Amino acid sequence: MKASLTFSLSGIYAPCSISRDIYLEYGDKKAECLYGTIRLPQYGPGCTPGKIVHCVLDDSLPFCSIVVPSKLFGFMPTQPTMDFCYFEPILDNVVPVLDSVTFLINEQLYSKLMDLPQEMQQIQFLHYKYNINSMETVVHSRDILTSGLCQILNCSPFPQGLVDFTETQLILVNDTEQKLSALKYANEDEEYALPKIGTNSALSIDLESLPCTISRDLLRPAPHINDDNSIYAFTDAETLLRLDVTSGSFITVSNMGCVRLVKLFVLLLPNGFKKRTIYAPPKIIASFPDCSVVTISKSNIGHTDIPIANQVFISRVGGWLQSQKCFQNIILTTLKKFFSESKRILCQNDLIPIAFDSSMADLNIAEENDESDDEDELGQYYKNDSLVWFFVTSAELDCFSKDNSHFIIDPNRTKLITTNITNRRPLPLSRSNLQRYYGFAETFYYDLHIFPYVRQLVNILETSFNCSQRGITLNASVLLHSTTNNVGKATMVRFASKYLGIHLLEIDCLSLTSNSRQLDSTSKIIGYIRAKCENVLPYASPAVIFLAHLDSILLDVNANQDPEAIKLQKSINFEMSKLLDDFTFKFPGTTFVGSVNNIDNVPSSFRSHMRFEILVPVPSEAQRLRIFQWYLSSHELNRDVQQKVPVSYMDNISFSSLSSYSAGLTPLDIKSIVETARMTATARFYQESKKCGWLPQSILITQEDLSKATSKARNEFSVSIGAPQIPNVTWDDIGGIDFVKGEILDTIDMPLKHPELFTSGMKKRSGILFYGPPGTGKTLMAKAIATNFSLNFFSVKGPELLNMYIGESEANVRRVFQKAREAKPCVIFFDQIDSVAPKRGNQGDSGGVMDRIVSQLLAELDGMSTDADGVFVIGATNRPDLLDEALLRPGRFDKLLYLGIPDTDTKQLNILEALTRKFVLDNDVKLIELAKLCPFNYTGADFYALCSDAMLNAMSRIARMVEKKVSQHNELTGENISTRRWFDKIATKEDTKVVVKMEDFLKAQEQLTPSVSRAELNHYEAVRANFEGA
Amino acid sequence: TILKNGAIQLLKKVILRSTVCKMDFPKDNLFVVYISDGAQLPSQKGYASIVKCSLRQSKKSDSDNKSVGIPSKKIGVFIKCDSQIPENHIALSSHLWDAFFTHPMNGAKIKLEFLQMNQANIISGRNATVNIKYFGKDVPTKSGDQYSKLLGGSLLTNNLILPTEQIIIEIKKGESEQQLCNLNEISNESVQWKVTQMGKEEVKDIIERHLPKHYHVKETGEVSRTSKDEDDFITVNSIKKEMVNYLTSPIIATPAIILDGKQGIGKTRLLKELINEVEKDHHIFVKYADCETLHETSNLDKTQKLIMEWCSFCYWYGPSLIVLDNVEALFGKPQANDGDPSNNGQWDNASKLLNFFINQVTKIFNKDNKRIRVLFSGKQKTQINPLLFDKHFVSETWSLRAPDKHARAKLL
């Protein structure tokens, strides 16, 4: 309800007094105290977060008008206030109860809180001291009672609710840092310095770009004129001791030779704005330079703004937005959309903004041969997407001699002009913030410090803005590349462009062409980029040309290099390079800004001409904090949605946690995580709303949700790019291994999580191999230790390195280190390494492929990643003597994992103790006697086989029971029913589910198969005597 | 605002989005529309029109004969309230879509004007006739009187047309208001008719308009529609029950969903009934296409034109769900083996198309979460081009599976 709104000096627990009429819509005997929904419309594009207050009827307020206590909005009524609220009554008046209540008080008062010796005495004294009512008090986090008193720190399970004075956490907190002294309710301590009333001009007040557009409704004055006020600037009551004239509705500015007259209005308390500045619409800042203006002057001459201009002059500002026929039609009609209801108010040479929706290109906007009265209704359905500047070319006129200082267009006057293009500098982001006003998909605002390469690039470009005064044409250029996709090169350049206040041209090479490199087509490729460049660059702006994904065009062929292929590409790359040079010769600056993925295959004959070769990393853990901060920022989530419920994070989150749990992820993954969270949140919200009960009027986000999404994302990465069958097992299940697993696990733990001992240039235990007999589980422990530290994982599943193509089969070896280097904290596991590891002294026969693959692999795994530290490699093979030579230092594995037979009776018991846990163990007889019964010759596979036999036998026993009961039931019927028609449809747990007893183990204990004969163990230990006995 | 007759005053204007809700009362009224109880109604009588939609005319003469768009020819209607429809949507009566000369489909926007008719246009006093011109060949004419019943009898307006069996309802005579006219309360003694005979010289001037004939294939017209070849489906796997909820959430993690499974496990029929249910429950528009048919896949430029067409169409209609059959033939990696990947250039011809598509759709999706979604179908999640997963275009997923014996029998 659009209830009318009024404010009171009454305190943070004074009641709301509701309108005497609307009481008929809400006041009823069911509630002892009324509670209503407070949503005062703040300055902002988004709606108001929900608040709730204790309420009473007002006997006196005008119809549909409300009094509120000012304190909940963080101000006293020292300045005028908004006169309407989106109030709502609450069905059944229900309110949630807080579990957490918290309050921050200064040290001196806190000493008094401590002098109150008991919690019940504290409550009894302090609730009365603060005039609080038991149970009847409803509060929010970031409520502040008074200065130095009761900052509401944290609340749960809601940020706001009722307090149970019998059973709630009422948490003492001492403001040992006097942070409360920084808090203020906007109240001034004293009258402001040196009022200048009666002066014709005022000074020392700045101008400041709006954080957003403001509605026609939010200004209190709203005179009915169809078009009168579009510049619509505003300033707080400070103007009233600067402008003596009655807060006059229009005022004028001149500096630097300009003329501005600006409609200027009041500002209200429900605000985030700073004092002593003109809050500036975009059309204002565009008309001034980047140089500040700090001056204002009173004038009434608005009636002299000429109501007839018999002609109209204008021009479009140059830009990439102007060059294309597939936009010209919308731009040309956007001329009409502009000048209709854009009655001009201002000097010539002005920069009027106009914007449009880029999707609309192919559409009839349904106004030509439709007319009538629809166009602003479609304009109510659309919303804009990209913005162009129009330059107010000086009108040539005959109605009046005064033409320059200001004129009015009226759409009753039929003229326009189109003098091709004019060139003008685009505004710097740091002053304009231009994007956030029109609400496009904002570029990420980088900082100039923490991504140092961005400082490098932006300085490299700024070189040529700055050298323009030195007159040297620096010809600056750069060529961006990354070892992996999705690093946001283009967005980063976009940022640099907007930050510096420099035009940018962009073309995407995946789009630009009717064909890839082909016969008789080089002209069809290259002329296109030539033409589209020529259409704009030598006309206007500093020269900045951005080409995406150049590797599409510029490629090099090593083999399959037949003439009909090679000659075309080989001509192409030069035929471009010559054009690039021609652009750099003819035009000023010609800053080529390239991008590519795999840098290796950029044509050297081109790349030699380039210079800065910036490598942009995947973001560090220190970087990604800023990423999450951005995407979780309220601006970025309370958009593209349109339902009135807003979204926010809440104080239980901490970006530090994500910084711990997120690594090896690109910005795209981060965005996908955050949106997956937002989806889970909205789903939870609506699903709860399906139940009557307390829930927030805003949708909230949780750490467990974010973590779950991170796991989902890392799985999606592993499924698409990584290995199948990710690390997925409980280390708890690898029983019986002892300080051997100790030394192993510590050896893979310490370089992973104690890096200060390991962030050093020396060698650091990069690889291990395993040579125990079969039946002690190596392959399991490999995935388990990988799970213990979330190692990236790649399995060489044996012989899949081999291929038909001698001369290319080695490629899978380079691939192994490619994928490892792409997944820096990785474990690489060669299972059954024998499959690519004969004797290194193989044969006096031919040096067949089996040797050439393995020796090259061993050499490369010795010779590379030995510098690029980080990877780990693991190998297992249940037969030692074939890996004879690679056990020496040049094979480097050098580690003696006789992960062989068990040695101790308790350890063998620990096997079944770790294995059986997933089914119900018997304990009516105790486990140790099985180990006593076992001959000391078995391994985990054997103990597995034993428990498997026992439990399967017990399943057969319960089957032999229930089959008898089914047979009896059949004899109790036609003996012919479908076997489904009883015990299964009844789903009798008692007759079907797990049963076992230890006598089925003892009965199963004889019939195992020790296929590892003791002769085999003896042979392996005899080899151990020289592999390992040293 | 008083119109050319002082009998008529104009109240308010709004634009609303057409939807289907399958509520009609043809035995009582026809030329009528229904509006939400939340869209509080200034008057129960008004004018409406389609907001015409067509391509830019991005090429000289549009490559076809028709020079200029036909005007809106807006029709007066009664407006009656219901709660059963979402806000700002309109239920448009069956005998009104055909007057708007397009197949009934949740889609285009309607104009709505709210109107006052003064006491100068009450019951009787202008016993006007109306021509019922036969616009196409017919039986030797039935009586004009029966049309007073079979048109429902609720309302009429000048120059009305009804293509269902091609009749024209028109009058141009003095001593009549020649505007909106009441009929619901009016006695049949207060009205007259001409069952005006056929005539080529008359109809051929009307046939100069845009006439993409709606029942040009032989199906006994709207008279009997002797062309059904479809049915319900046997609700075997609940996959529908999950997906139809998911794909109609207020907001979604990403624009795309992928549907896969063994050849012949029944992608196509399932998609058809997902389409139908989505087209009936929650007002989503659909456009549907087969990789077999759009044979431009040998070239880039015209294919790009098709993708931009679909994009633009979607963005002008309401929330929509694009669906594609056997997408592998359009966007799949063209060699299932990587082979020599064009000297590892990897950009074979196909992937360009898919990249342009994902770029465009992403640019749209960042604007507003509902404006478009896409639903792929294919053989296997991992066999379609991995670049589809690289950009995080897709996330949630389903697979069909061999139906379990119980439901399988219930299907049999």
Ligand SMILES: Nc1ncnc2c1ncn2[C@@H]1O[C@H](COP(=O)(O)OP(=O)(O)OP(=O)(O)O)[C@@H](O)[C@H]1O
């Ligand atoms: N560092 C970042 N900070 C904020 N947002 C980012 C960052 N990197 C990427 N993004 C987001 O993800 C998007 C990545 O798409 P973009 O067009 O920038 O990629 P690209 O540089 O062309 O990548 P690639 O060439 O690897 O495919 C950006 O538009 C932005 O929305």
Ligand SMILES: Nc1ncnc2c1ncn2[C@@H]1O[C@H](COP(=O)(O)OP(=O)(O)OP(=O)(O)O)[C@@H](O)[C@H]1O
């Ligand atoms: N904690 C444990 N200690 C010992 N053995 C175990 C343990 N947990 C499971 N096992 C057994 O280890 C067996 C695996 O044996 P082994 O490592 O020789 O086989 P593998 O993984 O197929 O071999 P390969 O490394 O040659 O590919 C499993 O069958 C399982 O029964």
Ligand SMILES: Nc1ncnc2c1ncn2[C@@H]1O[C@H](COP(=O)(O)OP(=O)(O)OP(=O)(O)O)[C@@H](O)[C@H]1O
């Ligand atoms: N669940 C079902 N409900 C109703 N009819 C079904 C169902 N499954 C299969 N059918 C029937 O079996 C036919 C076979 O399936 P359909 O023709 O849709 O396959 P498809 O998805 O086009 O197959 P593919 O692309 O692998 O050739 C359907 O046309 C339909 O008549």
Ligand SMILES: [Mg+2]
């Ligand atoms: Mg990119």
Ligand SMILES: [Mg+2]
């Ligand atoms: Mg193994």
Ligand SMILES: [Mg+2]
């Ligand atoms: Mg099919």
